Design a protein around this ligand. Structure first.
Ligand SMILES: [Mg+2]
Ligand SMILES: [Mg+2]
Lengths: 377, 377
């Protein structure tokens, strides 16, 4: 409430991926110690942490060990079972709580929470079997999109239904997992806003980013987003409403659709630093990682001013060879690589923040490097 | 020339203090592994390193061990002896070389090198005995400063001569060590410039910083330095010429005196990241540490644009309690703490970068915190 976790103390992180690694690096600058729990040895985060606990996320015993050596605990792994987070908020210090994670983990529960906040979402229906899929298609028509309610993107995730010809594919998915069908709402661009709220209630919002996805993987984030001032203001206001209604502590990434007629629909939420906020490491006065640490520790939040326009480009497994071969050409580019040993095609290996006074020159730079030819097409 | 050290390789650092730690943090963002050699276990740098070697700086076997596991070797500790330096330069990869470091270890050698590069310094005389002191006093008159040529660490090691009354104290100093006598420069401001030069000869120069020393220890760096455009241009030009003439690879801090009459004299050089460049971590497009890594690894250098005005304030052992107590008042302030256990009174425990569009507001903020009343007086 007024509880402050002072520099020198230990922050425990559940999950050792790139998000935890970058949380850790930010915390280290401020003089915090870092403990991490991850199922695989020498994770990106372990490479920066003082203490490594190699164990499963459901390993209640190892979770207790993390709780014992930590003064505060946060998570970066978003598919963690919220029963484990319920244990921590009662027996350790987890200022984020378990509630928000539980609401944002399931696309259906997520939509209900956005609606209760009074914000606009695409019309949606829960799909648990073929009869329900049929009814949902009949009610919402085409175009629509079927998405699994919980984390299961690896190989499938979603089916876009442009016409009746895509129904066969949707039925297969509907059998494989619980789904929601959402009406496809026409939009000009996807945008996101990172909002941070500390234990003491202090709230900061980062600049609106314009996101470009390829095969449903983030390719580029563009800041400032190439949208109207009024859309930017609305996006920012929407993020503040969510932080307050969801009683946020820590970080919330709000992904959005911006339509040609100036409206914003809330797409999805992530209760953590998000890929679309990586630009902040090089372009803002505080990074989202530095902010997240400040939020949970209850330090004054840093400023979120955009200090230079930026295009973040993702480096997937398929790009890493190209990046390393082209290192000599990275003038004006700020490389971040996560220390993952095995490259797989779609695995996130790093990102590059391209800073320029002109956003179009930054975009042209990414194209000129030809590392992302596959994405450009 | 062409040699590039790619992300994924190991950077070895001789010296595990805060400069090593901040080098290592910048390197980790880019996906490098870190090895460190330091006389004390659990050093600031070891807290972020993948491999720690605990040994003396003059222990050639340990130095050799660090070199053997490192793809490139750099140093934070300057007083490496010649036998270790030659071994490193010829049998490891030490792109910085030994030549520049040799020149900057002796105040007389250093001033000769600066003059030979075509740059101005205060008039000076070598003092190896009492007779040479007498002659130098005669030629330079009062006021003047007698300084030891080596041993840059604590204990003053200097005597300011304003009258014949001070000669007695000076003779004692010249009796214990080789000295240099320098004519007193009537200066308005102390300033410094950080210059970067990569293995391939690419150069970048950081903005001029105004430095405020108290008890021979840096207190504040102010950027932009409160000096005329003409003085700024001159300091930058001088720093570039030095980098060229000394064939710098890596980082060079050039400390200077700026007079009211618009003249610059070169004071002293540090062939490494420097305390007067810590502001770059929060206020510049690239930090001196990010730049140092790029320079030795022969990556393209980042930009050095000042993105927001800044006051860096040092946190000594005598300040850490005040910082921790005032943590809730650190809005607009960016805290860096080095992870040192033992807090001696004059030991550098961290720094705070105070960012503000108005330099005077930043200065005011430092005072209003009432942490540095001692320095303020
Ligand atoms: Mg979600
Ligand atoms: Mg020096």
């Amino acid at each position: 409430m007024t509880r402050i976790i002072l520099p020198g103390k230990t922050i425990g992180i559940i999950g050792g991926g790139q998000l935890g690694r970058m949380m850790a690096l930010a915390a280290k600058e401020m003089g915090y110690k870092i403990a991490v729990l991850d199922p695989t040895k020498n994770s990106p985060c372990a490479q920066v942490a003082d203490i490594e606990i190699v164990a499963s996320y459901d390993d209640l015993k190892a979770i207790q060990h993390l709780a014992e050596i930590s003064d505060v605990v946060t998570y970066e792994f978003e598919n963690i079972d919220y029963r484990c987070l319920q244990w921590l908020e009662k027996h350790a210090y987890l200022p984020q709580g378990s509630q928000l994670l539980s609401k944002t983990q399931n696309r259906f529960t997520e939509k209900n929470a956005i609606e209760k906040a009074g914000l606009p979402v695409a019309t949606y229906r829960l799909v648990q079997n073929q009869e329900q899929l049929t009814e949902a298609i009949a009610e919402l028509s085409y175009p629509s999109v079927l998405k699994t309610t919980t984390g299961g993107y690896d190989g499938k995730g979603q089916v876009v239904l442009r016409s009746e010809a895509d129904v066969d594919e949707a039925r297969k998915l509907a059998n494989a997992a619980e789904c929601i069908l959402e009406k496809w709402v026409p939009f000009e661009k996807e945008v996101s806003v990172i909002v941070i709220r500390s234990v003491s209630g202090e709230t900061k919002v980062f600049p609106v980013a314009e996101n470009i996805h390829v095969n449903n993987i983030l390719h580029e984030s563009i800041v400032p987003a190439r949208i109207t001032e009024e859309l930017s203001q609305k996006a920012i206001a929407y993020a503040k409403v969510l932080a307050d209604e969801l009683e946020l502590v820590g970080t919330l990434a709000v992904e959005m659709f911006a339509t040609a007629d100036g409206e914003i629909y809330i797409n999805e939420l992530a209760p953590r630093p998000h890929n679309s906020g990586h630009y902040t490491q090089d372009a803002c006065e505080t990074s989202q990682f530095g902010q997240h640490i400040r939020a949970i520790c209850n330090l004054p939040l840093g400023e979120t001013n955009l200090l230079k326009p930026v295009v973040m480009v993702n480096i997937l497994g398929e790009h890493i060879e190209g990046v390393l071969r082209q290192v000599n050409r990275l003038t004006g580019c700020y490389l971040h690589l996560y220390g993952k040993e095995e490259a797989k095609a779609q695995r996130k290996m790093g990102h590059v923040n391209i800073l320029n006074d002109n956003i179009e020159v930054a975009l042209e730079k990414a194209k000129s490097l030809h590392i992302w030819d596959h994405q450009e097409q």
